[PDB]
Structure formats: C-alpha cells, structure tokens
Design a protein around this ligand. Structure first.
Ligand SMILES: [Cl-]
Ligand SMILES: [Cl-]
Ligand SMILES: [Cl-]
Ligand SMILES: [Cl-]
Ligand SMILES: [Mg+2]
Length: 96
C-alpha cells in the first residue's frame, strides 16, 4: 500500500478562471469532462477543480497508486479544450 498522496494527481492548465466569468456552467462542463477522461485510468475517488486558481489546477485521487501513475503518464502534455495540460504526482503537502 501507499500514503494517500501516492494516489493523487495534480492536473494543471485545465482552464483559466476567466472561463467561468460569463457562464458558470462552463466550470461544471470541465469537471464532467475531466471525470469522463480520468475514468479511463482507474477508479476515481475524488476530483476537485480549484476554480479560482490562475494555473487551472485540478486534483484527482484514484483508488490505487498504479492508476495515478497511468493517469500521469497518459495525460501529461495532452490537449483539452485548446489547452495543453500537465499531470504530476502530488507531494502530500502543497495546497491549491
Ligand atoms: Cl491562459
Ligand atoms: Cl484515450
Ligand atoms: Cl468530482
Ligand atoms: Cl470541484
Ligand atoms: Mg506514483
């Protein structure tokens, strides 16, 4: 087994907060789309979007550390909604 953070992926550049200015529903569109996409890598335990964060941060927690690893390897550098995203392992201590 593993400490919790080994199951957690930090995804950046999913959005910019300006995206939700005119239409709050856009935030939920990106949440849903990220749920659908991250379901490819493993069983999602938690998914959060830090909707005010300039860097477009989301956290995704999986059931198993191997799922997080597969997500990081596959999503990093992909394009979503015109944005080139990154995916990194969480460190267990950085808050967004
Ligand atoms: Cl931007
Ligand atoms: Cl795919
Ligand atoms: Cl969620
Ligand atoms: Cl959220
Ligand atoms: Mg890992």
């Amino acid at each position: 087994g593993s400490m919790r953070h080994e199951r957690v992926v930090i995804i950046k550049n999913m959005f910019h907060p300006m995206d939700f200015e005119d239409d709050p529903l856009v935030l939920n569109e990106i949440r849903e789309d990220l749920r659908v996409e991250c379901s490819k890598f493993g069983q999602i335990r938690k998914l959060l979007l830090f909707d005010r964060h300039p860097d477009g941060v989301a956290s995704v927690s999986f059931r198993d550390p191997e799922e997080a690893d597969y997500c990081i390897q596959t999503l990093d550098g992909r394009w979503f909604g015109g944005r080139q995203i990154t995916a990194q392992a969480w460190d267990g201590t950085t808050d967004y």
